[PDB]
Amino acid sequence: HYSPFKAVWDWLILLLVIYTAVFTPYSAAFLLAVVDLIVDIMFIVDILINFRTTYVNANEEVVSHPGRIAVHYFKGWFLIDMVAAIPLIGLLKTARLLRLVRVARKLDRYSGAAVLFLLMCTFALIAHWLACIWYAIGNMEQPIGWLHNLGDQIGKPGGPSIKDKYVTALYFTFSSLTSVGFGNVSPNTNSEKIFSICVMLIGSLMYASIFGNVSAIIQRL
Amino acid sequence: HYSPFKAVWDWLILLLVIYTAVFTPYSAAFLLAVVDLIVDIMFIVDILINFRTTYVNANEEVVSHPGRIAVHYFKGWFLIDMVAAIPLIGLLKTARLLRLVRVARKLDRYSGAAVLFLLMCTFALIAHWLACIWYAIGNMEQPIGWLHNLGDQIGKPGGPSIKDKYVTALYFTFSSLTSVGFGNVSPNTNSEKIFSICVMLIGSLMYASIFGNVSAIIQRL
Amino acid sequence: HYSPFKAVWDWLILLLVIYTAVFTPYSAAFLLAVVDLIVDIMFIVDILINFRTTYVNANEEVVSHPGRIAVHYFKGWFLIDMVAAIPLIGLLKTARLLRLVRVARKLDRYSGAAVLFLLMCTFALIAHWLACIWYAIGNMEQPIGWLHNLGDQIGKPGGPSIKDKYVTALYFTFSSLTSVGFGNVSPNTNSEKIFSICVMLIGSLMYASIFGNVSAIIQRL
Amino acid sequence: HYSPFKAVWDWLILLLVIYTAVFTPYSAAFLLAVVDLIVDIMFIVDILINFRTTYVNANEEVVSHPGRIAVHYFKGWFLIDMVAAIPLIGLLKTARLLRLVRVARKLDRYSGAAVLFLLMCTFALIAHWLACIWYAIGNMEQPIGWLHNLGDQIGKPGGPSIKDKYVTALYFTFSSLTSVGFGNVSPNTNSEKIFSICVMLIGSLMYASIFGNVSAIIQRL
Ligand SMILES: [K+]
Ligand SMILES: [K+]
């Protein structure tokens, strides 16, 4: 768990965890090109590595005869990892998001020089998820909305391009998160306004917290 | 005052104090369904408990013969509690708001794990009260306003639904409090603009103070 | 300089200094009702008190024979105080603003319980002065502007009421200072936009500084 | 390197470095009056001074026979300084921006009384560069945009004045940087919106960092 190979491959599993975290909601809510397997099987490769690797107990160091820790990993958590590593409504691919638990246990690797990028990227991930939810709402809530008005802000009532309908949603989520509100996008229906209240509260929370933290990092530097 | 029964029932009296604080202004300014008695009488139950409970003096511990502290509670404060616990213009139900004093004396119970939720909920309560005031103003100031323009933002000039006319007011109060100002709602008349100056000042005060406090809590964690 | 009479009268001279500071620019830029003399002569009363009062030197305590300190006050600063206390273009009444120097020397009186109100009131004074400047600009810059558009936001192209044309300017200055920008007021001409850049910079400076200070006060409490 | 002449002339080279940093992008992206030479040759004057001046080694003090440090300056960095000091597409004048490196090595001169102005001026420089980029985008992205709409906000579809088309861009960059968003300017096309996301992130970063720093300076004072 501390070899150069283990270290670099763990950095790589974080990289591909970021990859899946940013590419599963996108194609899960926007698209209803063969790079899937190289990571869907890399995760079970990681599972087997977790089987064969070395580990430290509550006070026991790394031990030989590597069979004692497999049932221990299964007793700690393996079912969630397994259902993560499993390929009409095939929406269950969203369970792949459980790969986030992967970066919950190994934070001793990354916990100043990297935390800044990590905070900016988690802000970006939060923005991505909220833009995904906003697009889901603006597409589901049909019998006037915001997509109707985007259809006139850009002269494409048919249907605007998907790059446009995603970049605008990301723009709006950054607007509401960073408390600017340019006004070209404006929640107008009732579910929109309730989501806007929710996102304003979540902004006042997270935009304040992570940026107090980044100011603390700057001061520590 | 320190039994498990006393503790849980005090948490419950805080819960129902939040209940009344959030449900009296609402139906007091928006509505001019039998859950009233179960708390209006629970408050006088609490009064009798305050009579029969045990208490500590300036330096004296809890004493037997529980009759010495009743007149002492009456000398400290009982008239406000009594007029709180009392059922043309029956607007006097707003005096029920005095139940807030109930959570003024027992803050040693709640003063980190709960203070975060308490701060978010007091921000929500402030938002609720200011949205109530805004609705009162937008309904009273008649001979052009903001409700007139909401009648066109949502295609309902008659009268919009009460859920709509409340969710928009809460949306606007969160907007002005968190300094975003999406622009779909816009104070346009003179009393509106004076209220907007007042709320901008109260925002610059409270939005700054409570969030400095929440950043301090996060740092302490 | 330390009697109860001196103390209360100094608090009163601060009160009337606030009075003149908030009522000279207003009627100096908006109005081109006999309460003027009671303070214009109270200032020279204060001058005579400064003559007759007691004072402490660099190391010398209060001395008898009160004639040694008059020429000393005249050597320190008396000409500015005199030209302050003096009644076609009589715009020179703006020199009365020099009464602010009066509260520059006596800050040891007020320097926590009062500093909060003092900071809120100096924010209000800054808002007042900037709204005065904004009204001066919107009235002078004539050959499309913002007053033209206010004439349609409120159905009064003639001329809107002075209370309206002042409350809107104060609203806009609070907007730009507290970084909300509701959008009902919008700088559109070139001098307007240059003033807006200036006020945005002055906001980013002062709104940040005074509110860091008020957070520090809250933390000290 | 520590004479009064050296000190004042170094302050002057910082002044003219600010001059070139603020006047090269402007005329490099807006203008496609003989004050150029007096500084373009002053920079190579500075080069010769760096040749002839005195310097301190890792531990060696200033030494006589001033020929040992010339090749050392050439080994440290001279090619970038030389290509800085060198006069169809003559866009290579943007390489003059490398004069910023000049104020990278001599920060021990300026590192409280001056840092405030320096921070305000670097915020102004960032605003200038971003307004330059915004103008470049709004002029290049042709086959609806923001300049089209400015052509109606100010009644000049032809072409608006260059002072107007620059003061508006600086206004918008201050808006997006200080998180106000008055709404008179509104990104509407796709490249505009992507730039807006980028600038909102860069705002949330720098507007927070430099103003935490200015609050720290105020507290230190
Ligand atoms: K804002
Ligand atoms: K805004």
Side-chain angles (χ1 to χ4, degrees), chain A residues 1-5 7-9 11-16 18-36 39-41 43-45 47-54 56 58 62-73 76 78-81 83-91 93-101 103-107 109-110 112-139 142-163 165-218 221, chain B residues 1-5 7-9 11-16 18-36 39-41 43-45 47-54 56 58 62-73 76 78-81 83-91 93-101 103-107 109-110 112-139 142-163 165-218 221, chain C residues 1-5 7-9 11-16 18-36 39-41 43-45 47-54 56 58 62-73 76 78-81 83-91 93-101 103-107 109-110 112-139 142-163 165-218 221, chain D residues 1-5 7-9 11-16 18-36 39-41 43-45 47-54 56 58 62-73 76 78-81 83-91 93-101 103-107 109-110 112-139 142-163 165-218 221:
Chain A
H1 65 264
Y2 50 103
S3 75
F5 171 75
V8 184
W9 162 90
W11 270 102
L12 267 294
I13 193 163
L14 180 141
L15 193 150
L16 50 86
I18 278 172
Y19 167 88
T20 174
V22 309
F23 280 100
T24 65
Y26 177 29
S27 184
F30 276 96
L31 293 166
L32 298 86
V34 301
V35 285
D36 44 355
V39 74
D40 193 16
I41 292 88
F43 279 114
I44 182 154
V45 180
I47 290 293
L48 317 168
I49 301 148
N50 306 317
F51 274 164
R52 187 50 204 249
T53 179
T54 71
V56 170
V62 286
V63 194
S64 198
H65 270 87
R68 175 196 298 99
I69 52 176
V71 171
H72 171 73
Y73 170 47
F78 177 56
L79 72 162
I80 46 185
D81 312 336
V83 74
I86 291 169
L88 193 73
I89 295 190
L91 197 145
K93 60 179 75 177
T94 182
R96 289 157 199 190
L97 197 46
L98 276 293
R99 285 144 189 178
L100 262 69
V101 192
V103 286
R105 68 177 81 85
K106 40 174 52 183
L107 289 179
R109 174 103 49 191
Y110 320 99
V115 187
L116 171 147
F117 161 79
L118 193 58
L119 272 188
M120 194 60 178
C121 204
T122 179
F123 187 63
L125 260 74
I126 297 172
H128 188 231
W129 300 333
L130 279 149
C132 206
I133 299 150
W134 172 269
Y135 183 84
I137 291 169
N139 222 355
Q142 324 300 310
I144 65 178
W146 79 261
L147 199 145
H148 190 152
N149 293 136
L150 177 137
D152 301 347
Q153 304 162 47
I154 290 189
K156 305 182 192 166
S161 53
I162 294 312
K163 186 43 73 168
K165 270 190 317 201
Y166 168 82
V167 73
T168 290
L170 194 42
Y171 163 69
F172 158 90
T173 285
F174 273 101
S175 163
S176 286
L177 264 285
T178 322
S179 69
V180 166
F182 295 94
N184 47 25
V185 54
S186 44
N188 201 8
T189 191
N190 209 308
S191 199
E192 263 169 11
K193 280 173 199 188
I194 304 151
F195 176 60
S196 278
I197 309 301
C198 307
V199 72
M200 277 164 65
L201 196 151
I202 209 176
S204 88
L205 193 40
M206 286 298 179
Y207 164 94
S209 188
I210 68 170
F211 281 154
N213 205 316
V214 79
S215 171
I217 294 298
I218 285 290
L221 257 57
Chain B
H1 65 264
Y2 50 103
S3 75
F5 171 75
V8 184
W9 162 90
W11 270 102
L12 267 294
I13 193 163
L14 180 141
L15 193 150
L16 50 86
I18 278 172
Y19 167 88
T20 174
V22 309
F23 280 100
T24 65
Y26 177 29
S27 184
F30 276 96
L31 293 166
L32 298 86
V34 301
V35 285
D36 44 355
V39 74
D40 193 16
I41 292 88
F43 279 114
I44 182 154
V45 180
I47 290 293
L48 317 168
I49 301 148
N50 306 317
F51 274 164
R52 187 50 204 249
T53 179
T54 71
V56 170
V62 286
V63 194
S64 198
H65 270 87
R68 175 196 298 99
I69 52 176
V71 171
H72 171 73
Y73 170 47
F78 177 56
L79 72 162
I80 46 185
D81 312 336
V83 74
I86 291 169
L88 193 73
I89 295 190
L91 197 145
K93 60 179 75 177
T94 182
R96 289 157 199 190
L97 197 46
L98 276 293
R99 285 144 189 178
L100 262 69
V101 192
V103 286
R105 68 177 81 85
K106 40 174 52 183
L107 289 179
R109 174 103 49 191
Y110 320 99
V115 187
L116 171 147
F117 161 79
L118 193 58
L119 272 188
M120 194 60 178
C121 204
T122 179
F123 187 63
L125 260 74
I126 297 172
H128 188 231
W129 300 333
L130 279 149
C132 206
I133 299 150
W134 172 269
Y135 183 84
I137 291 169
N139 222 355
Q142 324 300 310
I144 65 178
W146 79 261
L147 199 145
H148 190 152
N149 293 136
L150 177 137
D152 301 347
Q153 304 162 47
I154 290 189
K156 305 182 192 166
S161 53
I162 294 312
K163 186 43 73 168
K165 270 190 317 201
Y166 168 82
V167 73
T168 290
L170 194 42
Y171 163 69
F172 158 90
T173 285
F174 273 101
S175 163
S176 286
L177 264 285
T178 322
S179 69
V180 166
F182 295 94
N184 47 25
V185 54
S186 44
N188 201 8
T189 191
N190 209 308
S191 199
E192 263 169 11
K193 280 173 199 188
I194 304 151
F195 176 60
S196 278
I197 309 301
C198 307
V199 72
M200 277 164 65
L201 196 151
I202 209 176
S204 88
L205 193 40
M206 286 298 179
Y207 164 94
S209 188
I210 68 170
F211 281 154
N213 205 316
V214 79
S215 171
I217 294 298
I218 285 290
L221 257 57
Chain C
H1 65 264
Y2 50 103
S3 75
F5 171 75
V8 184
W9 162 90
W11 270 102
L12 267 294
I13 193 163
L14 180 141
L15 193 150
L16 50 86
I18 278 172
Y19 167 88
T20 174
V22 309
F23 280 100
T24 65
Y26 177 29
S27 184
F30 276 96
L31 293 166
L32 298 86
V34 301
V35 285
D36 44 355
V39 74
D40 193 16
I41 292 88
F43 279 114
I44 182 154
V45 180
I47 290 293
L48 317 168
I49 301 148
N50 306 317
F51 274 164
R52 187 50 204 249
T53 179
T54 71
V56 170
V62 286
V63 194
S64 198
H65 270 87
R68 175 196 298 99
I69 52 176
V71 171
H72 171 73
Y73 170 47
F78 177 56
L79 72 162
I80 46 185
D81 312 336
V83 74
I86 291 169
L88 193 73
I89 295 190
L91 197 145
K93 60 179 75 177
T94 182
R96 289 157 199 190
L97 197 46
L98 276 293
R99 285 144 189 178
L100 262 69
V101 192
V103 286
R105 68 177 81 85
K106 40 174 52 183
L107 289 179
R109 174 103 49 191
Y110 320 99
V115 187
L116 171 147
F117 161 79
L118 193 58
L119 272 188
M120 194 60 178
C121 204
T122 179
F123 187 63
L125 260 74
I126 297 172
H128 188 231
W129 300 333
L130 279 149
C132 206
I133 299 150
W134 172 269
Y135 183 84
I137 291 169
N139 222 355
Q142 324 300 310
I144 65 178
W146 79 261
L147 199 145
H148 190 152
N149 293 136
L150 177 137
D152 301 347
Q153 304 162 47
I154 290 189
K156 305 182 192 166
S161 53
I162 294 312
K163 186 43 73 168
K165 270 190 317 201
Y166 168 82
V167 73
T168 290
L170 194 42
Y171 163 69
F172 158 90
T173 285
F174 273 101
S175 163
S176 286
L177 264 285
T178 322
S179 69
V180 166
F182 295 94
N184 47 25
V185 54
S186 44
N188 201 8
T189 191
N190 209 308
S191 199
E192 263 169 11
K193 280 173 199 188
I194 304 151
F195 176 60
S196 278
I197 309 301
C198 307
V199 72
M200 277 164 65
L201 196 151
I202 209 176
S204 88
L205 193 40
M206 286 298 179
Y207 164 94
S209 188
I210 68 170
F211 281 154
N213 205 316
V214 79
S215 171
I217 294 298
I218 285 290
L221 257 57
Chain D
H1 65 264
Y2 50 103
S3 75
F5 171 75
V8 184
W9 162 90
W11 270 102
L12 267 294
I13 193 163
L14 180 141
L15 193 150
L16 50 86
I18 278 172
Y19 167 88
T20 174
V22 309
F23 280 100
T24 65
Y26 177 29
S27 184
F30 276 96
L31 293 166
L32 298 86
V34 301
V35 285
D36 44 355
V39 74
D40 193 16
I41 292 88
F43 279 114
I44 182 154
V45 180
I47 290 293
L48 317 168
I49 301 148
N50 306 317
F51 274 164
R52 187 50 204 249
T53 179
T54 71
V56 170
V62 286
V63 194
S64 198
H65 270 87
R68 175 196 298 99
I69 52 176
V71 171
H72 171 73
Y73 170 47
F78 177 56
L79 72 162
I80 46 185
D81 312 336
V83 74
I86 291 169
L88 193 73
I89 295 190
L91 197 145
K93 60 179 75 177
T94 182
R96 289 157 199 190
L97 197 46
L98 276 293
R99 285 144 189 178
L100 262 69
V101 192
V103 286
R105 68 177 81 85
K106 40 174 52 183
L107 289 179
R109 174 103 49 191
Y110 320 99
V115 187
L116 171 147
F117 161 79
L118 193 58
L119 272 188
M120 194 60 178
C121 204
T122 179
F123 187 63
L125 260 74
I126 297 172
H128 188 231
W129 300 333
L130 279 149
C132 206
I133 299 150
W134 172 269
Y135 183 84
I137 291 169
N139 222 355
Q142 324 300 310
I144 65 178
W146 79 261
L147 199 145
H148 190 152
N149 293 136
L150 177 137
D152 301 347
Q153 304 162 47
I154 290 189
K156 305 182 192 166
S161 53
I162 294 312
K163 186 43 73 168
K165 270 190 317 201
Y166 168 82
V167 73
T168 290
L170 194 42
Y171 163 69
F172 158 90
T173 285
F174 273 101
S175 163
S176 286
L177 264 285
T178 322
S179 69
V180 166
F182 295 94
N184 47 25
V185 54
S186 44
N188 201 8
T189 191
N190 209 308
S191 199
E192 263 169 11
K193 280 173 199 188
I194 304 151
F195 176 60
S196 278
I197 309 301
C198 307
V199 72
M200 277 164 65
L201 196 151
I202 209 176
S204 88
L205 193 40
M206 286 298 179
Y207 164 94
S209 188
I210 68 170
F211 281 154
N213 205 316
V214 79
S215 171
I217 294 298
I218 285 290
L221 257 57

